[PDB]
Amino acid sequence: MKIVSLETHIVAVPPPHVGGMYWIFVKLKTDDGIEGVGEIYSATFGPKAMAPIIDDVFERHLLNRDPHHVERLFRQAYSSGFTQRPDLTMMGVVSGLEMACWDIIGKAAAKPVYELLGGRIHERLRSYTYLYPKNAKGEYDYDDPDLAAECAAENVKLGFTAVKFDPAGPYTAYSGHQLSLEVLDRCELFCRRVREAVGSKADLLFGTHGQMVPSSAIRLAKRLEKYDPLWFEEPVPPGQEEAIAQVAKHTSIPIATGERLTTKYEFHKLLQAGGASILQLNVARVGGLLEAKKIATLAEVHYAQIAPHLYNGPVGAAASIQLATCTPNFLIQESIMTWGGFHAEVVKTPIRWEDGYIIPSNEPGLGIELDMDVVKRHTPYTGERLHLQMGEHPVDVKDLAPA
Amino acid sequence: MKIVSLETHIVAVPPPHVGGMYWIFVKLKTDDGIEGVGEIYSATFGPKAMAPIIDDVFERHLLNRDPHHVERLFRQAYSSGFTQRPDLTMMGVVSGLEMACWDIIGKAAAKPVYELLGGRIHERLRSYTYLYPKNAKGEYDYDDPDLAAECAAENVKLGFTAVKFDPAGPYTAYSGHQLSLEVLDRCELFCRRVREAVGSKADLLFGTHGQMVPSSAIRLAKRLEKYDPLWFEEPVPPGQEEAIAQVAKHTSIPIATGERLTTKYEFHKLLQAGGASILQLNVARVGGLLEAKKIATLAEVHYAQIAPHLYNGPVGAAASIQLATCTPNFLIQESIMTWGGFHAEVVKTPIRWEDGYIIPSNEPGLGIELDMDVVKRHTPYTGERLHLQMGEHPVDVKDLAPA
Amino acid sequence: MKIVSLETHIVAVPPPHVGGMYWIFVKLKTDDGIEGVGEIYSATFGPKAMAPIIDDVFERHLLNRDPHHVERLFRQAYSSGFTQRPDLTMMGVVSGLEMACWDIIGKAAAKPVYELLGGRIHERLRSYTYLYPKNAKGEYDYDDPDLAAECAAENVKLGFTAVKFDPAGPYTAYSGHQLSLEVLDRCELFCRRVREAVGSKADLLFGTHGQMVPSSAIRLAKRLEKYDPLWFEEPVPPGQEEAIAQVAKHTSIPIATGERLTTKYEFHKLLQAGGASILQLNVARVGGLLEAKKIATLAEVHYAQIAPHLYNGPVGAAASIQLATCTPNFLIQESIMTWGGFHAEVVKTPIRWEDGYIIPSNEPGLGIELDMDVVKRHTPYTGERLHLQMGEHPVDVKDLAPA
Amino acid sequence: MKIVSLETHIVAVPPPHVGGMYWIFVKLKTDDGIEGVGEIYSATFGPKAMAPIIDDVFERHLLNRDPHHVERLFRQAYSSGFTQRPDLTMMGVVSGLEMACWDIIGKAAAKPVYELLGGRIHERLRSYTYLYPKNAKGEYDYDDPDLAAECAAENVKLGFTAVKFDPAGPYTAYSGHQLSLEVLDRCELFCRRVREAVGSKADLLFGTHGQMVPSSAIRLAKRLEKYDPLWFEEPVPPGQEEAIAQVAKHTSIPIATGERLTTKYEFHKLLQAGGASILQLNVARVGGLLEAKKIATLAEVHYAQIAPHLYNGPVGAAASIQLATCTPNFLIQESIMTWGGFHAEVVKTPIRWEDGYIIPSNEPGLGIELDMDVVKRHTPYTGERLHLQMGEHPVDVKDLAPA
């Protein structure tokens, strides 16, 4: 059995772009006709560059190889061009290729991938969502704490047991910075209002984006402690484990991070420093499902938990669900609302969500398949923006703009 | 003043490919007609992918910006797509763009870049080269210690005060590994024969490529100590600072590393661990000249030295020379032989080398300019290989193949 | 191009001596007629000793040298007389000479210095001032918390977003000491009253002067936490990094320090210890603009910020502004009120301040020039005192005198 | 009793300048006619600047004060101008003033100072000297190992039990650097030849001057171990305690340092790091005799020893002898040959040296007094040089010049 072909499909997400501007899918086919699908999470470079990058990685490191050989695939990609340290875009690309290989492995075995990576532990998966409150004009409003609270209350009625929000203002190319008193006040007020709305029915997830230097993150944490959030996410920019550990040392709120980290080597450094107790790996960035399993293993020996990140399509979500289902130290899975809308439209069988939980597929492989007619209608992406972007200018202390 | 255009020129290096398979050059032009040139060191992905990557970075982060704004450029590139941790390919790309900006800054000021980044310290720069011994058929031979010794002796006659060689066998996608006794013996024999040939006239640079796990590197170091090498290069794969520090703790031979690291953040982690005392940054990978100056600064406070890496074209070499000239903790500059051959042919005014030293240009900017007629004749690159590659299969203990 | 002459001008600051007793300026001229100006921050010895010191340093280490060679200048001064560790007065002197060299470098290039040291990042610079409340007799009163609060409120009306005050009593030759309960109470009361007056419109900067031993600083910090100051400045005397780090470990208030430290080597020791997260370098003490840039670089890799100190003339302020403008991890710039009064009178073009921010000059060099007619009228200084002094006697526990 | 007057005498040392270019003496007189003498060790600035510096410190911090109040004197000087961290020149100045105060204290009590600072422990003091070999032209020659060996043998005949030499080449403004193989070979050869000449009758003191970066110092130490030197002096430049500790960790040769450090605070940092086991304080630099006693105390609790430095006049030597005589952890005292020549001529009663040992005075105070007729004949100093200087240019690897 060997991989003989690749198709790349970069789908434009319709406005208002829930889950980002575009999703990068890859489809692999074997010599005996088994198809696998994967998703790539990487936006250092735009989709016009990503297409030839993916072709290059595939041709050099996967074409004509056995899909079962996922260690080989990872090592070849990781080492490409005399590197053998993490290249963030390469790791995103190989994540997509590798999970598509797992899709094929599972289909060949007639088993869900979770039955091959340790076996089912969970019958259903606790989930959370970002709050998506709308103002009177129908635009998402991330500035109004009362709209956030109302939205949280509605999510609790749906069955959610945790909600996430980021009231901490813009994250910019010059972050970390020192949040103003008005922004600190707003962060506290969001927690107060959301807590009032949900009581003990839902945890608060303080979903920051690395806006802060550690001294500012610590000031913020002291204010948030009275509302007992389940976590304080990405308190400082990634890439400096001692700095994030400094925040953890100075607050009782659990630190969660990881959506911008890749490979077991980076998570090892983070855990060695005491930098976080909740790891938010994205399976479409870290190196694929086996590498994600390895990261979960590191977490186990530190008594840390995994809470996989998701701000992308349903294929990466499906892979994330496969990992979560067989992970003993699983905390919660990020969901994009309840997986309806375009997340459901772009696949043949949507991800199942009920009363706060994701219900894993029992189908072989990743339990996901693109609807190619829908995919074709939403390609190509012609937008100017990357999947996500950081603010271009430093934050001004007098500015009250949302994240 | 602003940058209004970019040209990318990926030049095929003629056989036998000294300095690699291809060199990636960028040319910037300003609105008032000043031209700057730079070089990118990145081979995670091949040149077919690199061309649209470079266009993407330029369009998003540099087009219509002031070339003086190199902090801005670095921060925008470093943060691209909500990353803000090192993306190895992006850092290579921005290095080329940034050094081209410095070329323009220097031309506008009518000064060499070294007169703006701290001022001249060195009248000339100590240099070294890899040994390039040829067998009877005219092929480079990295297996014969006596040919290496003869070559070292000839380099000493030219005036070189240091020579580099790697007798430690293949570096592969599965490195680190544990060197066999026969390979350990060969490493020792190369040092013995080269030392006999050069006496105290030249330092030995043991130019390993991360072949080893730390326990193997330590076994090797104990054997090499009797020959007093100036350094033991990349004893283990990059990306794990505690592992390389373990080697440093167990040998008196200075550890040199850095050609596969990028940004001040990675070098900080390395130095904090005690991982190396000689930093082999490549100015075309680390983030550009200002970022390289920042790395040199980190080295200063640790009483470490810089020894910039060079396995690429004369534009990156020119930038490296600019940094070295104004660096107080400069040890030595890697040279590709004496900068003749294609390194001289592809530029209007070749890099000057005399009696073991590089003589820095007194011309404004980087002191380098491509000969576009030569460039045009050596584009496009149509080769199958990346600039450098790692071995595809794990080393077999019975194998005696060269690195 | 070379420096051929020096003039030293030690200007007496008129009563009530805002910014200290005297400012030490140096003027350099090149062989082709370019003039540069700098300022020296050093008061170990009085101005009668400083004049021949400056002549000595200039003659030995700068006369007939190229102003571009600022690495050379720093290394020669730093090493003078077989020292090569920080000599505090020498570092102040070389800071002035070096920034005057940058003034010349910028003028020769027709660029602001910030366009050569990384390029503009900030269009304007957040600033703060000490509170200068007056009693009914027109004397500055640092004892009355209500006068301080009223003054803070007026500063907020001007547009300031931070204010500084030191209610912690005398700093003496025998500091650190243990603050009395009455002084601790007063410190808390100042914060309470000032916070009431400014609300969330301005940060509190607790501007202590190293009065305390660490155990006392910790007692004070616990009292101040409820008012969420942006920083706790110089909680203990300089020169002992473990002691200041002990304070940082025991409070959530950011520790700021550095106005009495010099060179990257001292700031490295401070950061390695975790001693502070906000660095208050004075560009006229630390070794000059390049050395200050190096210190800012150290801060970057620790995710620390810079907040340059200023208690001196507008030339040092101009240099500080040049650094801040091109610094990505810039927090805030100390201002002496709004740069009016004698700070404006002594220069041809005053520093521009609007609505809480400093607006950097677009002029070449440091963007500053002394008005020599004003300088001549305010020389010589004939005062008995040093620029600043410490109390001669130990603090008595029953004493309630102001700092 | 109070100090009412100061005289400063900066004496030109006749060629060939053994003990440096000039010695800085201070003479204090009390209101009831007791005279004290001291020496200042500081050459950051030249003697033309030192004279008004000394006047300034004296006027502000000692004039009209009781000479017994040496804690007060130190604290006032240390704190001068809102500093309260070490200012190297100020510490040299106060050292001279303070030891002159001790001279007065001892005279008033009719006791040697050593009888007041702990009491006699040693009847005589083990001493060493630098080797001062002369070539055929009568010039001191520091390049010839056989001349050094011959000189060592003659010193052993005089009774010396230790000899010092520095074969490690120039120390420059850009040190540390990486010693060449030829220099490493020469260092080893000096040790070999000197050891052959002295056998076990004298220890070797490897008297380096901070030429090296730590990686180079470690390479050198491995070569020197076979000759069992008593110490490896100043292996790296001062001011970085972790770097010097790295050398200590990697060699069995004791590390000695301290002649360029000042105050108990700096020696504390050094000892905390494990940076040295032999402290070479100079009593005329560290802050005076009480501060030196405090440094010796720090050494005691670390089981370190003191070996005071001396490269200056007989007044500082006399003070050093006073400290040594009452120090339980005393190793050896640096002597300038046998204290003859100008060291004897400039005082009324020369320092006594017999069979390898200094014999402490039994006279009150420091047991030393300047011959003012000789002093007058050798003032003023009109030389261009500082007391000691560092090389202006970086060392070239091909250069074989002496230190």
Cβ-defined contact of A237 to C304 (cutoff 8 Å)? no
Cβ-Cβ pairs closer than 8 A, A with C, add up to 62
Q: Give me the residue label for tokens 């409150």.
A: A133
Residue C95 C-alpha, separation from nearest chain D C-alpha, in angstroms: 15
Structure tokens at B339: 């900068």
Closest-approach residue (CA) in chain D for B327? D174
Q: Give me the residue label for tokens 């076990």.
A: D200
**CATH number of the domain to which B380 belongs:** 3.30.390.10
Is some CB atom of chain B closer than 8 A to the CB atom of D326?
A: no
Q: Which residues of B touch A174 (CB under 8 A)?
A: 75
- C-alpha B317/C-alpha B305 separation (Å) is 18
Residue C62 C-alpha, separation from nearest chain B C-alpha, in angstroms: 13
DSSP E strands, A301-365:
305-306, 333-335, 352-354, 357-359
Angle at C116 between CA C112 and CA C118, to 5 degrees: 115
Closest-approach residue (CA) in chain B for D175? B329
Experimental determination approach used: X-ray
Touch between D and A (at least 3 CB pairs under 8 Å): no
What resolution in angstroms does the PDB record give? 1.4
- In angstroms, the first-to-last Cα distance of chain A is 48
Which amino acid appears at position B121 of this protein? I
Angle at C324 between CA C320 and CA C330, to 5 degrees: 130
Q: Are residues C327 and C385 in the same domain?
A: no
Range of the domain at A150: 111-365
Q: For residue B371, count other CB atoms closer than 10 A to its CB.
A: 14
Q: Are residues D15 and D69 in the same domain?
A: yes
Cβ-defined contact of B203 to D181 (cutoff 8 Å)? yes
Is some CB atom of chain D closer than 8 A to the CB atom of C276?
A: no
DSSP E strands, D56-138:
125-130
- C-alpha C279/C-alpha C267 separation (Å) is 8
Please state, in angstroms and as integers, the Cα–Cα distance from residue C275 to each residue in B366, C203, C254, C259, D71, following that order: 40, 21, 10, 14, 28
Is some CB atom of chain C closer than 8 A to the CB atom of D49?
A: yes
**Beta-ladder partners of A298:** none
Structure tokens at B21: 């398979």
Torsion sign, CA atoms B112, B116, B117, B121: positive
Q: Are residues A218 and A360 in the same domain?
A: yes
Q: Are residues B326 and B384 in the same domain?
A: no
Secondary structure of residue B268 in the 3-state scheme: helix
Residue C157 C-alpha, separation from nearest chain D C-alpha, in angstroms: 33
Q: Are residues A64 and A117 in the same domain?
A: no
- C-alpha B294/C-alpha B303 separation (Å) is 14
Is some CB atom of chain D closer than 8 A to the CB atom of B303?
A: yes
Give the β-pairing of D22-30 and D3-12: antiparallel
**CATH number of the domain to which A209 belongs:** 3.20.20.120
Q: Are D386 and D46 in contact (CB under 8 A)?
A: yes
- C-alpha C318/C-alpha C361 separation (Å) is 9
Contacts of B33 (CB under 8 A, 6+ apart): none
Q: Are residues D341 and D375 in the same domain?
A: no
Q: Which residues of C touch D386 (CB under 8 A)?
A: 60, 80-82
Torsion sign, CA atoms C382, C387, C393, C395: positive
**Beta-ladder partners of B215:** none
- C-alpha B298/C-alpha B288 separation (Å) is 15
Angle at D229 between CA D224 and CA D234, to 5 degrees: 80
Q: Are residues B28 and B147 in the same domain?
A: no
- C-alpha A117/C-alpha A322 separation (Å) is 9
Residue D197 C-alpha, separation from nearest chain C C-alpha, in angstroms: 31
Q: Are residues B124 and B166 in the same domain?
A: yes
Which amino acid appears at position B260 of this protein? R
- In angstroms, the first-to-last Cα distance of chain B is 48
- C-alpha C350/C-alpha A271 separation (Å) is 52
- C-alpha C332/C-alpha B198 separation (Å) is 57
**Beta-ladder partners of C39:** C25
Please state, in angstroms and as integers, the Cα–Cα distance from residue B111 to each residue in B107, B192, C74, following that order: 6, 46, 21
Q: For residue B340, count other CB atoms closer than 10 A to its CB.
A: 13
Quick one: CA torsion of B363, B366, B367, B373, rounded to 10 degrees? -140
Q: Are residues C21 and C101 in the same domain?
A: yes
- C-alpha D111/C-alpha D364 separation (Å) is 4
Angle at which helix C88-109 crosses helix C47-61, to 10 degrees, equals: 60
Angle at D394 between CA D393 and CA D400, to 5 degrees: 100
Helix (H) or strand (E) run with residue A35 in it: strand A35-40
Q: Are residues A252 and A401 in the same domain?
A: no
- In angstroms, the first-to-last Cα distance of chain D is 48
Helix (H) or strand (E) run with residue A125 in it: strand A125-130
Touch between B and D (at least 3 CB pairs under 8 Å): yes
Residue B1 C-alpha, separation from nearest chain C C-alpha, in angstroms: 12
Torsion sign, CA atoms A375, A377, A382, A386: negative
Structure tokens at B62: 């540099």
CA gyration radius, chain B: 20
Please state, in angstroms and as integers, the Cα–Cα distance from residue D323 to each residue in C222, C362, D7, D67, D116, following that order: 44, 59, 24, 18, 10
Secondary structure of residue B37 in the 3-state scheme: strand
Q: Are residues C209 and C85 in the same domain?
A: no
Number of domains in chain A: 2
Angle at which helix A314-325 crosses helix A289-301, to 10 degrees, equals: 40
Closest-approach residue (CA) in chain D for C93? D45
Secondary structure of residue D325 in the 3-state scheme: helix
Q: Give me the residue label for tokens 């006693």.
A: D293
Which amino acid appears at position A262 of this protein? T
Cβ-defined contact of C56 to D48 (cutoff 8 Å)? yes
- C-alpha B70/C-alpha B72 separation (Å) is 5
The three-state DSSP-derived secondary structure of C296-325 is HHHHHHCCCEECCCCCCCHHHHHHHHHHHH
Q: Are B88 and A83 in contact (CB under 8 A)?
A: yes
Alpha helices in D274-389 (DSSP H): 289-301, 314-325, 341-345, 372-377
Q: Give me the residue label for tokens 């006229």.
A: C284
Q: Are residues D154 and D246 in the same domain?
A: yes
Which amino acid appears at position C398 of this protein? K
Contacts of D326 (CB under 8 A, 6+ apart): D114, D115, D117, D118, D119, D120, D121
**Beta-ladder partners of D125:** D358
Is some CB atom of chain B closer than 8 A to the CB atom of C116?
A: yes
Is some CB atom of chain C closer than 8 A to the CB atom of D390?
A: yes
